Amino acid sequence: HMNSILITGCNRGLGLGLVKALLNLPQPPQHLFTTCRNREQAKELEDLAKNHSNIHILEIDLRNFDAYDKLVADIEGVTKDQGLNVLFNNAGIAPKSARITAVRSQELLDTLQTNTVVPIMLAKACLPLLKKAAKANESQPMGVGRAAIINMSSILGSIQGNTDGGMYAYRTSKSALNAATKSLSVDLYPQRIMCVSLHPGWVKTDMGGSSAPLDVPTSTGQIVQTISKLGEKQNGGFVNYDGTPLAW
Amino acid sequence: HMNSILITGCNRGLGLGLVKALLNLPQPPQHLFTTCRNREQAKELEDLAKNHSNIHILEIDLRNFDAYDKLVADIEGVTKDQGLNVLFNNAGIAPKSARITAVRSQELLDTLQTNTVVPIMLAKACLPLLKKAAKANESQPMGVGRAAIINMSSILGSIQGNTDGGMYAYRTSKSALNAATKSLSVDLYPQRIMCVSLHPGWVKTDMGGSSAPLDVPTSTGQIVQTISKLGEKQNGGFVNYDGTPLAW
Ligand SMILES: NC(=O)c1ccc[n+]([C@@H]2O[C@H](COP(=O)([O-])OP(=O)(O)OC[C@H]3O[C@@H](n4cnc5c(N)ncnc54)[C@H](OP(=O)(O)O)[C@@H]3O)[C@@H](O)[C@H]2O)c1
Numbered sequence: 001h002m003n004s005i006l007i008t009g010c011n012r013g014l015g016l017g018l019v020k021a022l023l024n025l026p027q028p029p030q031h032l033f034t035t036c037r038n039r040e041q042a043k044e045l046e047d048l049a050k051n052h053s054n055i056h057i058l059e060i061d062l063r064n065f066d067a068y069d070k071l072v073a074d075i076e077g078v079t080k081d082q083g084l085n086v087l088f089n090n091a092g093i094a095p096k097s098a099r100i101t102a103v104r105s106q107e108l109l110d111t112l113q114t115n116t117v118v119p120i121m122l123a124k125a126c127l128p129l130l131k132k133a134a135k136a137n138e139s140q141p142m143g144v145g146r147a148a149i150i151n152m153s154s155i156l157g158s159i160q161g162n163t164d165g166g167m168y169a170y171r172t173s174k175s176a177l178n179a180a181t182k183s184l185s186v187d188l189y190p191q192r193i194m195c196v197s198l199h200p201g202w203v204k205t206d207m208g209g210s211s212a213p214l215d216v217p218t219s220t221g222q223i224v225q226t227i228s229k230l231g232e233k234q235n236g237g238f239v240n241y242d243g244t245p246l247a248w
Numbered sequence: 249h250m251n252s253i254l255i256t257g258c259n260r261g262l263g264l265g266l267v268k269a270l271l272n273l274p275q276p277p278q279h280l281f282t283t284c285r286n287r288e289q290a291k292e293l294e295d296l297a298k299n300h301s302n303i304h305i306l307e308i309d310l311r312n313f314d315a316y317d318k319l320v321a322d323i324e325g326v327t328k329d330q331g332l333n334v335l336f337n338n339a340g341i342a343p344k345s346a347r348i349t350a351v352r353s354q355e356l357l358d359t360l361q362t363n364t365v366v367p368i369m370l371a372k373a374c375l376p377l378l379k380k381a382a383k384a385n386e387s388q389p390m391g392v393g394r395a396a397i398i399n400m401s402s403i404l405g406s407i408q409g410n411t412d413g414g415m416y417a418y419r420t421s422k423s424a425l426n427a428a429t430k431s432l433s434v435d436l437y438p439q440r441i442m443c444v445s446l447h448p449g450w451v452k453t454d455m456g457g458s459s460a461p462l463d464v465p466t467s468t469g470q471i472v473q474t475i476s477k478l479g480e481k482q483n484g485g486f487v488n489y490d491g492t493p494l495a496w
C-alpha cells in the first residue's frame with residue numbers, strides 16, 4: 001500500500017491512466033498528488049478531483065526549478081511526518097521524428113531538460129520527503145510501500161536494443177534518465193529508497209499514437225500492479241510494464 | 249591510413265596526446281585539423297603546428313552552433329573531393345564531484361550541452377564531408393581509412409557497470425553520447441560510415457587526475473592504434489582503449 005504518491009503530468013495519457021488505476025485499487029493512496037500545467041484544462045483530472053478527495057492537484061511547469069521548493073512545501077504540509085512514499089516522474093516529451101540531417105540543437109536541449117534534468121531535480125527536491133517515508137516504514141522491505149522513485153523511461157532508451165536509429169533527442173534523454181536511475185539507486189540505498197526506470201510498453205496516447213498495441217488502462221493497470229510488486233532485487237533496474245528486466 | 253581527421257579539444261589532455269600519436273605514425277594524416285578555443289594559448293599545439301604543416305589549427309568554441317557552417321567550409325576547401333575521413337569528438341567537460349543533494353540544474357544542462365549536444369551537432373555538420381570520404385574510398389572496408397565518427401565516451405557512461413553512483417551530469421551525458429553513437433551507426437550504415445564510442449581508459453589529465461593508472465602517450469598511443477583496427481564488426485559499439493567491448 002502506498003500512503004502517498006506524487007505523479008507528474010496527469011491531465012493526459014499515462015499520467016491520467018495511472019491516477020485512475022491507483023483509485024481502482026482496493027486500498028487506494030490516502031494522498032495522491034498530481035501535477036499539471038493548466039488546472040483550468042485537465043477537466044477530466046479536475047473532475048476526478050471533485051469526486052475523489054484523496055486526489056490533490058498541484059499546478060506547476062516542471063521547467064521552473066525555483067518553483068520546486070514550494071511544491072515540496074505543500075506536500076510536506078499534508079503528509080508531515082509520514083513523508084512521500086513515491087515520486088513517479090511521468091512528465092515527458094517526444095519531438096517529431098527527424099533524420100540526423102535535420103536535427104536541431106534546441107530540440108535536443110529542450111528534450112534533455114524535460115526528460116532528464118527535471119526528473120533528477122525533482123528527485124533531489126523530494127529527497128527529504130522520501131527519506132522520512134523510508135524511515136517511517138523502516139520495518140518494511142524495499143518497495144512502493146516504503147519509499148521509491150519510479151522514472152518513466154522508454155524501450156527506445158535501450159541502447160543495446162536500438163536497431164532502428166534516429167530519434168536523437170528522445171533516445172539520448174531516456175538513456176540519460178536510465179543512467180540517473182542507476183546512480184540514484186546506489187546513492188539512496190543507505191535510506192533504502194528504491195529507484196527504477198520503467199517502460200510502460202507501447203501505449204496509444206498522443207505520444208504513443210494509434211498504432212500502439214496497448215491501451216491506457218491495460219498498461220497503467222499492469223504498471224500500478226508491477227510497481228506494487230517491485231522489491232530490492234529490482235532496485236536500480238530497467239523493467240518492462242509487466243516487470244520483465246530490460247537491457248540498458 | 250587516415251588522409252584527413254578532425255579532432256576537437258587538442259590544446260590539452262587526450263586531444264593533444266592524440267595529435268602527437270597521429271604524427272608518430274609511419275604514414276601520418278595529410279590533413280590533421282585541430283580545434284581549440286584560444287589559439288593564443290595552446291602554445292604546445294601552436295608549436296607543433298609551426299613544426300608540422302599537416303596540422304591545421306581551427307579556432308572555435310563548440311557551443312557556438314552557428315559557427316559550424318564555417319568550420320566545415322574551411323575543411324572542405326582544404327580536402328575538397330576527398331572529404332573528411334574521421335571526426336573525433338574529443339572535447340568534453342566533467343564538473344566537480346557532487347552528491348545528489350547538491351546537484352545544480354545548470355551544471356546538468358551545461359554538461360549535457362558540451363558532452364552530448366555538441367558531438368551530435370558536429371556529426372551533423374560533418375556528414376557531407378564524411379560521406380564524400382566514404383564514397384571516395386567505397387572500395388575499402390569500413391574503418392578510419394574510409395569514414396568514421398569516434399565519440400570519446402567514458403566507462404562512467406556504462407550504466408550496467410555503474411556501482412558507485414553520483415556524477416549525475418557526467419554520467420548522463422556520456423550515456424546519452426553512447427545512445428547517439430548507436431543511432432548514428434544505424435543511420436549512417438548506408439554510406440558505410442563507422443561510429444563508435446571509445447573509453448580512453450583512466451588517464452592522468454586535468455580531468456583524469458594524478459591517480460589515473462595510464463599516462464597520455466600510453467592511452468593515446470593505443471587509441472590511435474585501436475581506432476586504426478576498428479572495422480564493421482565493431483560498428484555502433486562501445487570499446488575500451490585497447491578495443492575490448494564494453495557494456496552500455
Ligand atoms: N506512449 C508511449 O508509448 C510511451 C512509451 C514509452 C515511454 N513513454 C513515456 O511515458 C510518459 C508519459 O507519456 P505519454 O504517453 O502520456 O505522453 P503525453 O500523453 O504526451 O503526456 C505527456 C505528459 O507530460 C506532461 N509534460 C510535458 N512537459 C511538461 C513540463 N515541462 N512540465 C510539466 N508537465 C509536462 C504533459 O503535460 P501537458 O498536457 O501540459 O503537455 C502530459 O501530461 C513519458 O515520460 C513518456 O516519455 C510513453
Ligand SMILES: NC(=O)c1ccc[n+]([C@@H]2O[C@H](COP(=O)([O-])OP(=O)(O)OC[C@H]3O[C@@H](n4cnc5c(N)ncnc54)[C@H](OP(=O)(O)O)[C@@H]3O)[C@@H](O)[C@H]2O)c1
Pocket residue numbers: 256257258259260261262263284285286308309310311337338339340341342362400401402403447448449450451452453454455456457460
Ligand atoms: N581523463 C580521463 O581519464 C578520461 C576518461 C574517460 C573519458 N574521458 C573523455 O576524454 C575526452 C578528453 O578529456 P581530457 O581528459 O583530455 O580532459 P581535459 O584535459 O579537461 O580536456 C578537455 C578538452 O576539451 C575542450 N573543451 C571543453 N569544453 C569545450 C568547448 N565548449 N568547446 C571546445 N573545446 C572544449 C578543452 O578545451 P579548453 O582547454 O579550452 O577548456 C580541452 O581541450 C573527454 O571527452 C572526456 O570526457 C577522459
